[PDB]
Structures are given as structure tokens and as C-alpha cells.
Design a protein around this motif. Structure first.
Motif, PDB file in Angstrom:
ATOM      1  N   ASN A   1      49.759 117.271  -8.021  1.00  0.00           N
ATOM      2  CA  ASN A   1      50.333 116.634  -8.971  1.00  0.00           C
ATOM      3  C   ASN A   1      50.130 117.757 -10.331  1.00  0.00           C
ATOM      4  OD1 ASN A   1      51.174 114.153 -10.196  1.00  0.00           O
ATOM      5  ND2 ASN A   1      49.329 114.619 -11.592  1.00  0.00           N
ATOM      6  N   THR A   2      50.723 117.618 -11.214  1.00  0.00           N
ATOM      7  CA  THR A   2      50.509 118.251 -12.720  1.00  0.00           C
ATOM      8  C   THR A   2      50.943 117.131 -13.914  1.00  0.00           C
ATOM      9  OG1 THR A   2      52.853 120.025 -10.972  1.00  0.00           O
ATOM     10  CG2 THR A   2      52.474 120.107 -13.919  1.00  0.00           C
ATOM     11  N   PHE A   3      50.027 117.844 -14.710  1.00  0.00           N
ATOM     12  CA  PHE A   3      49.842 117.259 -16.584  1.00  0.00           C
ATOM     13  C   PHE A   3      51.375 118.430 -17.245  1.00  0.00           C
ATOM     14  CE2 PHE A   3      46.497 115.391 -12.847  1.00  0.00           C
ATOM     15  CZ  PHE A   3      46.833 113.969 -13.957  1.00  0.00           C
ATOM     16  N   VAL A   4      51.198 117.739 -18.075  1.00  0.00           N
ATOM     17  CA  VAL A   4      52.161 118.087 -19.362  1.00  0.00           C
ATOM     18  C   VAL A   4      51.274 118.305 -20.566  1.00  0.00           C
ATOM     19  CG1 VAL A   4      53.769 118.920 -20.823  1.00  0.00           C
ATOM     20  CG2 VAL A   4      53.917 118.248 -18.145  1.00  0.00           C
ATOM     21  N   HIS A   5      49.939 119.410 -20.510  1.00  0.00           N
ATOM     22  CA  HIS A   5      50.175 119.277 -22.645  1.00  0.00           C
ATOM     23  C   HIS A   5      50.785 119.780 -23.584  1.00  0.00           C
ATOM     24  CE1 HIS A   5      46.360 119.206 -19.449  1.00  0.00           C
ATOM     25  NE2 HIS A   5      46.809 120.133 -19.303  1.00  0.00           N
ATOM     26  N   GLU A   6      51.259 118.682 -23.912  1.00  0.00           N
ATOM     27  CA  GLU A   6      52.685 118.766 -25.182  1.00  0.00           C
ATOM     28  C   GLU A   6      52.918 117.426 -25.144  1.00  0.00           C
ATOM     29  OE1 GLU A   6      53.512 121.338 -26.183  1.00  0.00           O
ATOM     30  OE2 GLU A   6      53.375 122.655 -24.400  1.00  0.00           O
ATOM     31  N   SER A   7      53.711 116.790 -26.901  1.00  0.00           N
ATOM     32  CA  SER A   7      53.734 115.639 -27.389  1.00  0.00           C
ATOM     33  C   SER A   7      55.038 115.282 -26.196  1.00  0.00           C
ATOM     34  CB  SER A   7      54.312 115.799 -28.986  1.00  0.00           C
ATOM     35  OG  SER A   7      55.804 116.431 -28.391  1.00  0.00           O
ATOM     36  N   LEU A   8      54.408 113.531 -26.129  1.00  0.00           N
ATOM     37  CA  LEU A   8      55.419 113.187 -25.614  1.00  0.00           C
ATOM     38  C   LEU A   8      56.709 113.112 -26.018  1.00  0.00           C
ATOM     39  CD1 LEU A   8      55.843 110.301 -23.286  1.00  0.00           C
ATOM     40  CD2 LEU A   8      55.884 108.346 -25.519  1.00  0.00           C
ATOM     41  N   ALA A   9      57.111 113.412 -26.992  1.00  0.00           N
ATOM     42  CA  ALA A   9      58.518 114.115 -27.900  1.00  0.00           C
ATOM     43  C   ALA A   9      59.494 114.979 -26.994  1.00  0.00           C
ATOM     44  CB  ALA A   9      58.406 113.418 -29.110  1.00  0.00           C
ATOM     45  N   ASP A  10      58.303 115.737 -27.274  1.00  0.00           N
ATOM     46  CA  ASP A  10      58.605 117.563 -26.537  1.00  0.00           C
ATOM     47  C   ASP A  10      58.790 117.438 -24.864  1.00  0.00           C
ATOM     48  OD1 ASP A  10      58.625 118.702 -29.271  1.00  0.00           O
ATOM     49  OD2 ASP A  10      56.942 119.986 -28.142  1.00  0.00           O
ATOM     50  N   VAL A  11      58.096 115.687 -24.313  1.00  0.00           N
ATOM     51  CA  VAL A  11      58.904 115.973 -22.956  1.00  0.00           C
ATOM     52  C   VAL A  11      59.955 115.522 -23.166  1.00  0.00           C
ATOM     53  CG1 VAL A  11      57.549 114.992 -21.040  1.00  0.00           C
ATOM     54  CG2 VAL A  11      56.490 116.573 -22.072  1.00  0.00           C
ATOM     55  N   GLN A  12      60.478 114.057 -23.181  1.00  0.00           N
ATOM     56  CA  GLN A  12      60.667 113.335 -23.937  1.00  0.00           C
ATOM     57  C   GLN A  12      62.019 113.945 -23.972  1.00  0.00           C
ATOM     58  OE1 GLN A  12      59.554 108.403 -24.361  1.00  0.00           O
ATOM     59  NE2 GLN A  12      59.974 110.472 -26.139  1.00  0.00           N
ATOM     60  N   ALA A  13      62.353 115.105 -24.654  1.00  0.00           N
ATOM     61  CA  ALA A  13      63.694 115.897 -24.663  1.00  0.00           C
ATOM     62  C   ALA A  13      64.377 116.400 -24.223  1.00  0.00           C
ATOM     63  CB  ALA A  13      63.338 116.964 -25.930  1.00  0.00           C
ATOM     64  N   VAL A  14      63.561 116.745 -22.980  1.00  0.00           N
ATOM     65  CA  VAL A  14      64.175 117.511 -21.623  1.00  0.00           C
ATOM     66  C   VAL A  14      64.862 117.126 -21.598  1.00  0.00           C
ATOM     67  CG1 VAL A  14      62.840 118.929 -20.254  1.00  0.00           C
ATOM     68  CG2 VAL A  14      61.589 118.890 -21.138  1.00  0.00           C
ATOM     69  N   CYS A  15      65.025 116.096 -21.140  1.00  0.00           N
ATOM     70  CA  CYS A  15      66.177 115.100 -20.645  1.00  0.00           C
ATOM     71  C   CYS A  15      67.207 115.334 -21.951  1.00  0.00           C
ATOM     72  CB  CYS A  15      65.907 113.577 -21.474  1.00  0.00           C
ATOM     73  SG  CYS A  15      64.400 112.795 -19.783  1.00  0.00           S
ATOM     74  N   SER A  16      67.619 115.974 -22.084  1.00  0.00           N
ATOM     75  CA  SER A  16      69.091 116.720 -22.856  1.00  0.00           C
ATOM     76  C   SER A  16      68.706 118.477 -23.745  1.00  0.00           C
ATOM     77  CB  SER A  16      68.774 116.189 -24.744  1.00  0.00           C
ATOM     78  OG  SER A  16      67.971 116.228 -25.777  1.00  0.00           O
ATOM     79  N   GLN A  17      68.240 119.244 -22.328  1.00  0.00           N
ATOM     80  CA  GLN A  17      67.821 120.245 -22.352  1.00  0.00           C
ATOM     81  C   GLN A  17      68.800 120.963 -20.927  1.00  0.00           C
ATOM     82  OE1 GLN A  17      64.202 121.487 -23.156  1.00  0.00           O
ATOM     83  NE2 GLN A  17      64.070 120.079 -24.831  1.00  0.00           N
ATOM     84  N   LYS A  18      68.186 122.176 -20.260  1.00  0.00           N
ATOM     85  CA  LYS A  18      69.090 122.280 -19.165  1.00  0.00           C
ATOM     86  C   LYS A  18      69.090 121.462 -17.882  1.00  0.00           C
ATOM     87  CE  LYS A  18      69.797 126.192 -16.907  1.00  0.00           C
ATOM     88  NZ  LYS A  18      71.180 125.903 -16.878  1.00  0.00           N
ATOM     89  N   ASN A  19      70.543 121.064 -18.041  1.00  0.00           N
ATOM     90  CA  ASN A  19      70.882 121.041 -16.818  1.00  0.00           C
ATOM     91  C   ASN A  19      70.757 121.438 -15.331  1.00  0.00           C
ATOM     92  OD1 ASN A  19      74.317 118.713 -15.270  1.00  0.00           O
ATOM     93  ND2 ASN A  19      71.269 118.525 -14.998  1.00  0.00           N
ATOM     94  N   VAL A  20      69.925 120.786 -14.635  1.00  0.00           N
ATOM     95  CA  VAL A  20      69.372 121.609 -13.677  1.00  0.00           C
ATOM     96  C   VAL A  20      69.885 120.437 -11.744  1.00  0.00           C
ATOM     97  CG1 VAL A  20      68.377 123.832 -14.348  1.00  0.00           C
ATOM     98  CG2 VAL A  20      66.858 121.965 -13.531  1.00  0.00           C
ATOM     99  N   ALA A  21      70.459 121.081 -10.974  1.00  0.00           N
ATOM    100  CA  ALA A  21      70.124 120.175  -9.634  1.00  0.00           C
ATOM    101  C   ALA A  21      68.151 120.444  -9.373  1.00  0.00           C
ATOM    102  CB  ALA A  21      70.964 121.420  -8.377  1.00  0.00           C
ATOM    103  N   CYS A  22      68.441 119.040  -8.875  1.00  0.00           N
ATOM    104  CA  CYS A  22      66.984 118.041  -8.507  1.00  0.00           C
ATOM    105  C   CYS A  22      66.598 118.570  -7.420  1.00  0.00           C
ATOM    106  CB  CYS A  22      66.495 116.428  -8.764  1.00  0.00           C
ATOM    107  SG  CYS A  22      66.909 116.082 -10.293  1.00  0.00           S
ATOM    108  N   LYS A  23      65.575 119.059  -7.317  1.00  0.00           N
ATOM    109  CA  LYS A  23      65.134 118.731  -6.173  1.00  0.00           C
ATOM    110  C   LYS A  23      66.017 118.633  -4.256  1.00  0.00           C
ATOM    111  CE  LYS A  23      61.148 121.739  -6.040  1.00  0.00           C
ATOM    112  NZ  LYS A  23      59.504 121.811  -6.390  1.00  0.00           N
TER     113      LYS A  23
END
Length: 124
Positions: free
Chosen positions: A44-66
Motif C-alpha cells: 500500500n502506498t501513501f501520498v504526502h501531497e495536498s488533496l487538491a494536488d492529488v485530485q488534479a492528477v485526474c486531468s494530467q497524463k492519460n495512461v493505460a491502467c494495469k
């Protein structure tokens, strides 16, 4: 029910600490976040960034899921994360983890309206 969005926050967000706190961080956090209730969740991975910064990834680089779905997104910047991995000698209910800090691009699956992270796919 707990929403998919809330569940991702519980399992994967820790903006309170800027990096893997101690050598005991995973042992405390996997327990306090309820990732040891039924089994020892093995990784399990924990991310140490603001909620906003992580939520913003949803408009960043589109890639295939595993799993082959197309709704994953890779962060343009690197993010402070901690990976938690189960030790060889960990035995439920006393779940034991090695706590590793890194700075990596994260990949999240997003869904919904609003379009928000619901799964942690990878770090690269």
C-alpha cells in the motif's frame, strides 16, 4: 456505504506528514487506516501531497491502467510517497511492514462527477 473517493483518501492520502515518518510509519498507518482489519493488505502506498494536488492528477497524463482500462492518469510532477510492503515474518493480526520513502510519479484511476481518484495504480 463509504464512497469510492473517501475510500481512496483513507487508503492513500497522508498530507499531514511531508515524508515517511519513522521506521514504524507503515506499521502504525496500515493499522490506523484499517488496512489490517480483515487480512494484512500486502502492499500500500501513501501520498504526502495536498488533496487538491492529488485530485488534479485526474486531468494530467492519460495512461493505460494495469487492468487495461483507459481511466488512469500519471502525475506530471513527482510526489512524495511512502510504500508499505509486508515483511516475510508478518503474521495477521500482527501485521508488519517495511516503510520506504520515495519521490515518484503516481498513477491513479479516476471516476465519477466530480472526476476524482478512486484507485492507486502505480508509482513510476
Amino acid at each position: 456505504k463509504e464512497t469510492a473517493a473517501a475510500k481512496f483518501e483513507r487508503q492513500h492520502m497522508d498530507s499531514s506528514t511531508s515524508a515517511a515518518s519513522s521506521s514504524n510509519y507503515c506499521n502504525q498507518m496500515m493499522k490506523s487506516r484499517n488496512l489490517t482489519k480483515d487480512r494484512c493488505k500486502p502492499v500500500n502506498t501513501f501520498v504526502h501531497e495536498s488533496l487538491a494536488d492529488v485530485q488534479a492528477v485526474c486531468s494530467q497524463k492519460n495512461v493505460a491502467c494495469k487492468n487495461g482500462q483507459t481511466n488512469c492518469y500519471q502525475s506530471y510532477s513527482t510526489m512524495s510517497i511512502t510504500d508499505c510492503r509486508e515483511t516475510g515474518s508478518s503474521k495477521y493480526p500482527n501485521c508488519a511492514y517495511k516503510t520506504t520513502q520515495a519521490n515518484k510519479h503516481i498513477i491513479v484511476a479516476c471516476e465519477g462527477n466530480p472526476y476524482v481518484p478512486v484507485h492507486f495504480d502505480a508509482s513510476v
